């Protein structure tokens, strides 16, 4: 299977701050029809996890433009500026050009003082 | 909207038996692939089993750690998808959530709520 590791599994950051998530795969995620399926999950306590960005760099619906998904190929970054309250929870990153469909560790983000 | 909902999570011993239900709806249940994915408190997330739509036989698909023990299936006509385990593991205890491919967005773009297993 596709193994996605991302860092760091904790991300303190102050509020209105930047946090940049690294994830990466074990092979390249460029499907045969040439688009990439690397997608963002964020879940919150409880709950169960929400498709935040797909296909690298595509907001779902209702995500602010303040995530900003890139890169290609095996290594990709979510970046989450201007950080609020509202962000706080676990952001994944999965692929789902190769089955079966596989997922990162997880990266809480949270508010540092 | 597109909806999905668990339920019969619950406290089991190893080697026991517990069959999970997931009621849709809010897209076409016979066109969709349906799945069960897993939140291992090991693992992390991890895909567990998928059955396929009638016009590809409705075949079924698992991953190595469960197969022989854990059988997925569907009906149609309730816009159900089921998963039923046996010979548990302590190694199967995690939140279970039931997914599907969808037509707008042919990966697992929509969840239910999740119901948790834990294996004593």
């Known amino acids: 299977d596709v193994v996605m590791t991302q860092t760091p599994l904790s991300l303190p950051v102050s509020l209105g701050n930047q946090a940049s998530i690294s994830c990466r795969s074990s092979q390249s995620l460029v499907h045969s029809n040439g688009n990439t399926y690397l997608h963002w999950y964020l879940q919150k306590p409880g709950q169960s996890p929400k498709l935040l960005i797909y296909?690298?760099?595509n907001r779902f619906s209702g995500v602010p433009d303040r995530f900003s998904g890139s890169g290609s190929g095996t290594d990709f970054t979510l970046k989450i500026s201007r950080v609020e309250a509202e962000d706080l929870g676990v952001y994944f990153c999965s692929q789902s050009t190769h089955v079966p469909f596989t997922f990162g560790s997880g990266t809480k983000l949270e508010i540092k003082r | 909207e597109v909806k999905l909902e668990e339920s019969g999570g619950g406290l089991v011993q190893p080697g026991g038996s517990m069959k999970l239900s997931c009621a849709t709806s809010?897209?076409?249940?016979?066109?969709?692939?349906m799945d069960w994915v897993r939140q291992s408190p090991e693992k992390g997330l991890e895909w567990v089993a998928e059955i396929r739509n009638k016009a590809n036989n409705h075949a079924t698909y698992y991953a190595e750690s469960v197969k022989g023990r854990f059988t997925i299936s569907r009906d149609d006509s309730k816009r159900r998808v089921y998963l039923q385990m046996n010979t548990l593991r302590a190694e199967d205890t995690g939140i279970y959530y039931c997914?599907?491919?969808?037509?707008?967005?042919?990966?697992?773009?929509?969840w239910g709520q999740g119901t948790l297993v834990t294996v004593s």
């Open positions: 296909k690298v760099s």
């Open positions: 997914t599907g491919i969808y037509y707008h967005y042919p990966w697992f773009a929509y």
């Open positions: 809010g897209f076409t249940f016979s066109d969709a692939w």
